[PDB]
Design a protein around this ligand. Structure first.
Ligand code: NA
Ligand code: RH
Ligand code: RH
Ligand code: RH
Ligand code: RH
Ligand code: RH
Ligand code: RH
Ligand code: RH
Length: 129
């Protein structure tokens, strides 16, 4: 599924992302835009053999099992394929574990480089919650 801005804000709200560990909802929408352009089916092969999966581009080296990432862990105990579903539960819940791992949202390069410092409120504007 390719979500719209407000459709995605709504679902991320439902699953408890608004100010999870202090990050306002707009941070999470902004990250999904620049990571996946809101495409749940997005995959990106990395030069090291790992793959980023889904709307928050969660990486196979640490967080999910894709069966072909050498010397990797499955810290969210999920197959990477579950991160590509039109229901964002597995991505949202895996995100909660990633953001808790000390770097916060700095774990997402697109968030650090394009969302950090900016008015991330622009992303949840004109959305019913
Ligand atoms: Na893995
Ligand atoms: Rh939950
Ligand atoms: Rh765009
Ligand atoms: Rh949902
Ligand atoms: Rh959850
Ligand atoms: Rh770590
Ligand atoms: Rh750590
Ligand atoms: Rh609400």
């Amino acid at each position: 599924k390719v979500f719209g801005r407000c459709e995605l804000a709504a679902a991320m709200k439902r699953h408890g992302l608004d100010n999870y560990r202090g990050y306002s909802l707009g941070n999470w929408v902004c990250a999904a835009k620049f990571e996946s352009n809101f495409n749940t089916q997005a995959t990106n092969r990395n030069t090291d053999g790992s793959t980023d999966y889904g709307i928050l581009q969660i990486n196979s080296r640490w967080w999910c099992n894709d069966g072909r990432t050498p010397g990797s862990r499955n810290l969210c105990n999920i197959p990477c394929s579950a991160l590509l579903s039109s229901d964002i539960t597995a991505s949202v819940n895996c995100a909660k574990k990633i953001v808790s791992d000390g770097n916060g949202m700095n774990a997402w390069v697109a968030w650090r480089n394009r969302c950090k410092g900016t008015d991330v409120q622009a992303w949840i504007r004109g959305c019913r919650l």
